[PDB]
Design a protein around this ligand. Structure first.
Ligand SMILES: *[C@@H]1O[C@H](CO)[C@@H](O[C@@H]2O[C@H](CO)[C@@H](O[C@H]3O[C@H](CO[C@H]4O[C@H](CO)[C@@H](O)[C@H](O)[C@@H]4O)[C@@H](O)[C@H](O[C@H]4O[C@H](CO)[C@@H](O)[C@H](O)[C@@H]4O)[C@@H]3O)[C@H](O)[C@H]2NC(C)=O)[C@H](O)[C@H]1NC(C)=O
Ligand SMILES: *[C@@H]1O[C@H](CO)[C@@H](O)[C@H](O)[C@H]1NC(C)=O
Ligand SMILES: *[C@@H]1O[C@H](CO)[C@@H](O)[C@H](O)[C@H]1NC(C)=O
Ligand SMILES: *[C@@H]1O[C@H](CO)[C@@H](O)[C@H](O)[C@H]1NC(C)=O
Lengths: 389, 146, 49
């Protein structure tokens, strides 16, 4: 059978194809080549090219996709466009899958959306567990985007629940102007910094901190982003910074490594950027989340064979016939993807359960030193080294 | 329109633009306000906003105004009031997650001044201020910004 | 005490190890110190006389 998926992707003019759309079509091609999953059903896509940070263009392309009719829509990354797409599809009952975190208003009453980004409440609680493991007292949190405080809404709100004192600083609008911020960082004599930004901004401020002479044994930077393996830690491994962080991308399994290798030669078409400081030829978290999103919606399809795509109209509010059943089938799947165990909160659409690997920087590079889970605490196997007879 | 139904606000905005309109006095939410702002920015029709919304810095739309006073100046006024009262320990209590954007100058203020801030969040129920105020008993915090 | 090219190589390998801070201080016996590239070492704060 032929099934159609809705793909909305904010395109860049000229250049290569975008990474998320490449992951989406790679996931479609690998599912179509496989016969163990979806044996008598084939998948088609309809990718769209919208502008960045626009919602009306996303509204028009979503209305055109519903005129064509799709099983589900894979939304964009900006918050306003994803909010408009989520409201449009929740008005029509078509399920929404989003791979990026967005701030959600508590008064919203939508129920046709799932988000496969890990929730920053659980991420910030993991960061608090990591801070309490390191016995810190004074923490400086440097945040990039003004929404990011909500992403640290649990971490900032720590009133006397732990002996901790916070100083919060914002990165400037320009990327290169971290030097006055790092000069006030150095003169303030604060040595435990939590960086909340993207991986490219993290590499940029790591270059700025190396130029500022912040790479000693006194600094123990913590990155909230999950793309630390995309960083090139070659000019920092002999320094003595500690650089603890998190990783959801389960590279321990051989099948995930095989999927990464099958991604790699389609990824190596784009040339590297030596000025960026990013290790080229690697999966970002967003591409792996899009791949796992396609796999979760595919295994949700496989339990529901009565799947007829019906064209819908934006001018009316006629709901889809197979809305609630397919939504409930989506909201209970348990698929082992590249990020490991995938499940959803039954009262939300948020992936509040996962399995993080706590990595850090040593003289060999980056290595896994601990394991964090929301149900348990934090294992931290270097503290499990004491096993007396 | 209904409560935070941005598709419905988009449809009503399209109907009012089809009827012909000089300018649109927009809704009081955030998501529907963003949708109406993008729709009228595409079609060259001026937007009027009376409630503050969180503004994305990546947005290059210029076809709107906002007559609510900006919370940067409000937060600087609150910081000036705190500096006039010469406080040292401030407990800031908010209710909605956007309020940290509305008071972010006060949270960045301990880096530039001498202060100590403890922030707390009201629960999702209205009458549940009784446990939180009990923490006001336990913290002995007498300087509260609501 | 080395050549200026050897001094540049030593300074690069010292930056890779994070050797230079405000704690440290270098004297170079060579007379080609002005011909070196002091662009990445300037903003950290090193005496380097
Ligand atoms: C779906 O989403 C829901 C939220 O939308 C999830 O509900 C959340 O569940 C978690 C449990 O996993 C709750 O976590 C914690 O609270 C306890 C005790 O409460 C402290 O918090 C309360 C807040 O209301 C107060 O009432 C208490 O008096 C006290 O102030 C803490 O002990 C927990 O820490 C435990 O977890 C962390 C990290 O795992 C460790 O560091 C701790 O040592 C200990 O291990 C949490 O802080 C959370 O409050 C709750 N949120 C809401 C809004 O209800 C729900 O679990 C989720 N469901 C699924 C299936 O995912
Ligand atoms: C940083 O890493 C080194 C690497 O061996 C380790 O010995 C040290 O305990 C770490 N932590 C610090 C310096 O706080
Ligand atoms: C921690 O990991 C070790 C092996 O890595 C395992 O034996 C142990 O049970 C784990 N502990 C917890 C609490 O998960
Ligand atoms: C290096 O120079 C700075 C000022 O430029 C000075 O304060 C410091 O003491 C010097 N370091 C020494 C002499 O070791």
């Amino acid at each position: 059978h032929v099934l159609r998926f809705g793909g909305i992707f904010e395109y860049v003019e000229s250049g290569p194809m975008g990474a998320e759309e490449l992951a989406f079509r790679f996931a479609v091609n690998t599912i179509n080549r496989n016969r163990t999953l979806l044996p008598n059903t084939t998948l088609t896509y309809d990718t769209q090219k919208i502008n960045l940070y626009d919602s009306f263009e996303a509204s028009k392309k979503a209305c055109d996709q519903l005129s064509l009719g799709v099983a589900a829509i894979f939304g964009p990354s900006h918050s306003s466009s994803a909010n408009a797409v989520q409201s449009i599809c929740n008005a029509l009952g078509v399920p929404h899958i989003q791979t990026r975190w967005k701030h959600q208003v508590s008064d919203n009453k939508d129920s046709f959306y799932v988000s496969l980004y890990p929730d920053f409440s659980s991420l910030s609680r993991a960061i608090l567990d990591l801070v309490q493991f390191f016995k810190w007292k004074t923490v400086t949190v440097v945040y990039d985007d003004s929404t990011g405080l909500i992403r640290l809404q649990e971490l900032i709100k720590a009133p006397s629940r732990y002996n901790l004192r916070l100083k919060i600083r914002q990165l400037p609008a320009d990327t290169k102007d971290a030097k006055p911020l790092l000069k006030e960082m150095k003169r303030g004599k604060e040595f435990h910094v939590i960086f909340d930004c993207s991986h490219e901004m993290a590499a940029g401020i790591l270059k700025q901190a190396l130029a500022m002479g912040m790479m000693t044994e006194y600094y123990h930077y913590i990155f909230t982003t999950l793309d630390l393996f995309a960083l090139d830690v070659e000019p920092y491994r002999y320094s003595g910074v500690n650089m603890t962080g998190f990783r959801i991308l389960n590279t321990e399994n051989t099948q995930v490594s095989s999927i990464i290798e099958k991604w790699s030669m389609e990824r190596l078409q784009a040339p590297p950027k030596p000025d960026s400081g990013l290790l080229d030829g690697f999966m970002t978290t967003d591409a792996a989340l899009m791949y796992d999103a396609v796999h979760v919606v595919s295994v949700a399809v496989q339990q529901f064979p009565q799947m007829t795509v019906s064209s819908l109209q934006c001018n009316r509010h006629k709901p889809w016939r197979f809305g609630t059943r397919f939504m409930s089938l989506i909201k209970e799947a348990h698929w082992e993807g590249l990020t490991g165990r995938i499940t959803f909160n039954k009262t939300n659409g948020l992936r509040t359960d996962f399995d993080l690997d706590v990595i850090s920087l040593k003289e060999e590079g980056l290595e896994k030193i601990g394991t964090w889970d929301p149900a348990s605490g934090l294992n931290m196997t270097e503290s499990q080294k004491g096993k007396p007879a």
